[PDB]
Amino acid sequence: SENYLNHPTFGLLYQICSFGDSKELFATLYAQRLFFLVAFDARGTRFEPIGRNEARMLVDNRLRQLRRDASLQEYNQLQQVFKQTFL
Template identity: 55%
Template sequence: MTSENYLNHPTFGLLYRICIVEENQELFTTLYAQRVFFLVSYNAEGLLFQPVTRADARLTIDTRIRLLRRNGQILESQELQSTMQKNFPG
C-alpha cells in the first residue's frame, strides 16, 4: 500500500507526488489541474523545483514502470501504471 505525499510549491500551491524517480528526486503534479509537472530534488540545502513538460513527465513515469518491472516490483509497477492512466488517459 502506498501513502500519498504532498508538497507546497511557492507559486502553484499544493503538489501531489506521482512517483519516486531516483534517490532524492520525485515527480509531482499540481493537485487540482494535474497539468503542470515538476521534478523535485532535495538535499541538505532544500528543495529544487524543476518544471517538466507533460511529455517528459509521461516518459519519466514510463521509465520508472519499466525499472520496477525489471526489479521484480510488480505490485508497485501496477500501481504506477494505474496512476499513469489517470494522469494521461488515452
C-alpha cells in the same frame, strides 16, 4: 504511499513516482496539469518544472524498471497464488 508538497505558486502537489533516489516527480493538484522534478539540496528544497511529454516518458521508463524489481514481482506473485495456497 501518499506524499504531498506545497509549491509557492501552484499550491499543493501530489507525488506521481520517484526518480529515484534521490528525486521525485510531482504534479499540480489544483491545475491541470503541470509537472515538477523535486529534490532536496538542501539549503534548500528545490523545484524544476518539466513538460508533460517528458514527465510521461520518465514515468514510462520507471514503470518498465519497476516491473522487473524483485519486491514488486515477489508481491505480484504472492498475490496470484495466496488464495489457492491458503484461502
